[PDB]
Design a protein around this ligand. Structure first.
Ligand SMILES: CC(=O)N[C@H]1[C@H]([C@H](O)[C@H](O)CO)O[C@](OP(=O)(O)OC[C@H]2O[C@@H](n3ccc(N)nc3=O)[C@H](O)[C@@H]2O)(C(=O)O)C[C@@H]1O
Ligand SMILES: CC(=O)N[C@H]1[C@H]([C@H](O)[C@H](O)CO)O[C@](OP(=O)(O)OC[C@H]2O[C@@H](n3ccc(N)nc3=O)[C@H](O)[C@@H]2O)(C(=O)O)C[C@@H]1O
Ligand SMILES: [Ca+2]
Ligand SMILES: [Ca+2]
Lengths: 225, 225
């Protein structure tokens, strides 16, 4: 096979929250369109695929000049895993060698430059994931986990709960915007986090994820800096 | 000595953020007053002390009918630890036996009922802390910690990052509203988290902490249910 860099944008029609979320407009452009534009402007991809079950989403993708994979209902339900959708897209276009990047439409402030910056961290020899991430608002060592009913244990040391944050290791969470993997590795492991995983760090501002109407408005306000 | 249940409300005059924050009004009552009212209505305390360096805060505390400890400047600076303020209050009134509870004015939706509910968890024989806490918005096992420059390691397992949250242990963070300790233990350990620490769980709504003008408005709106 030819090695290919593939972008997969999963955009199902039924959004369990905000209705028709993937086509909702932000500064005049659909969420889908913002992420398609990021994929194109990154110049990182040989193939850009929108995977959907919805006719309106498919028409939007075609109007932006990218490929469409149609998902049957069982891969677009509320319970369907993202990994099964990415696997189905790769099987449909016939790629099992190269890289595959998931780009969620719910991260509209993730730009093509962010994608290029993340790609520069990918190690073609070692082939761990590159995942975009942002700093944790509340430090995860300053937490306790339930071990029994009404019984809790510190995440690490009890003394961590009173340590100045600057004296603790820096902590990060995935923000959903970018997951880059070696294609054969993603197929074999059937997941998005493959060791050794590297992080591409983004600001809290650029990590906004759209769930609510107020999220859409905040993202618009951020664009209008 | 007589064993005493002491409440200490630390309320310094200089707020590094919102100016004069501890006297800012919320539905007509100062933040200080809301927490004093919680301490009184809990009926958990033999002594209620407001510790401050500020004349206006001291006058407000006296008007609510509680005791005042005056802190010298070195215990009320931007760098001064909360524990040193609680230790100084206990030394001033001469108590080293019983319980001591820190009640921060920045948690105005923490009520007297919350204080009673937390106190019911305190174990007078084993004498670990009781700390009020709320659920973590982002699960702390779904994080990575920096171990070297540009090198990160999962908090626990890499597979935790893709686990449904409901399949992970429940996680909680202190919310700042209540810290209950055995008095002799707090003096000896010079800290607020003493094993075995128990958690009193509060909702995200009741855990609001005041840092901004918008925080004050949100807390007011919550009160007006
Ligand atoms: C990679 C992955 O597991 N993605 C999941 C993400 C991820 O964990 C977070 O965003 C990280 O912060 O979480 C979810 O993210 P969510 O349900 O909002 O979906 C994000 C975007 O992906 C599309 N989608 C999702 C699943 C699927 N089978 N097909 C799809 O087309 C949606 O239409 C939307 O554009 C979640 O909220 O539960 C579910 C997603 O499946
Ligand atoms: C127990 C403890 O360590 N408290 C600290 C808390 C705590 O960790 C969080 O609230 C938990 O979510 O964090 C701080 O909390 P913060 O600075 O807002 O202070 C909270 C309240 O305590 C008063 N205060 C604080 C310290 C001190 N030496 N004297 C005081 O009178 C303030 O006037 C205000 O009413 C922080 O933001 O850094 C600093 C506080 O010292
Ligand atoms: Ca989501
Ligand atoms: Ca604070």
């Amino acid at each position: 096979m030819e090695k290919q860099n593939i972008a997969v944008i999963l955009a199902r029609q039924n959004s369990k929250g905000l209705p028709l979320k993937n086509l909702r407009k932000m500064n005049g452009i659909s969420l889908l369109g913002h992420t398609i534009n990021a994929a194109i402007s990154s110049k990182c991809f040989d193939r850009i695929i929108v995977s959907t079950d919805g006719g309106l989403i498919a028409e939007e993708a075609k109007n932006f000049g990218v490929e469409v994979v149609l998902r049957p209902a069982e891969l677009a339900s509320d319970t369907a895993s993202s990994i099964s959708g990415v696997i189905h897209a790769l099987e449909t276009i016939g790629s099992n060698s190269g890289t595959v990047t998931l780009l969620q439409p719910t991260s509209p402030l993730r730009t093509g430059a962010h994608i290029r910056e993340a790609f520069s961290l990918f190690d073609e020899k070692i082939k761990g994931s590159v995942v975009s991430a942002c700093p944790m608002e509340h430090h995860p060592l300053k937490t306790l986990l339930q071990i029994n009913n009404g019984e809790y244990a510190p995440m690490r040391h009890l003394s961590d709960l009173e340590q100045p944050r600057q004296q603790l290791p820096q902590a990060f969470r995935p923000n959903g915007a970018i997951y880059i993997n070696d294609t054969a590795s993603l197929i074999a492991n059937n997941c998005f986090f493959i060791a050794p995983t590297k992080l591409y760090i983004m600001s809290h501002q650029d990590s906004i994820d759209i769930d609510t109407e107020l999220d859409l408005q905040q993202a618009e306000n951020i664009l209008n800096h």
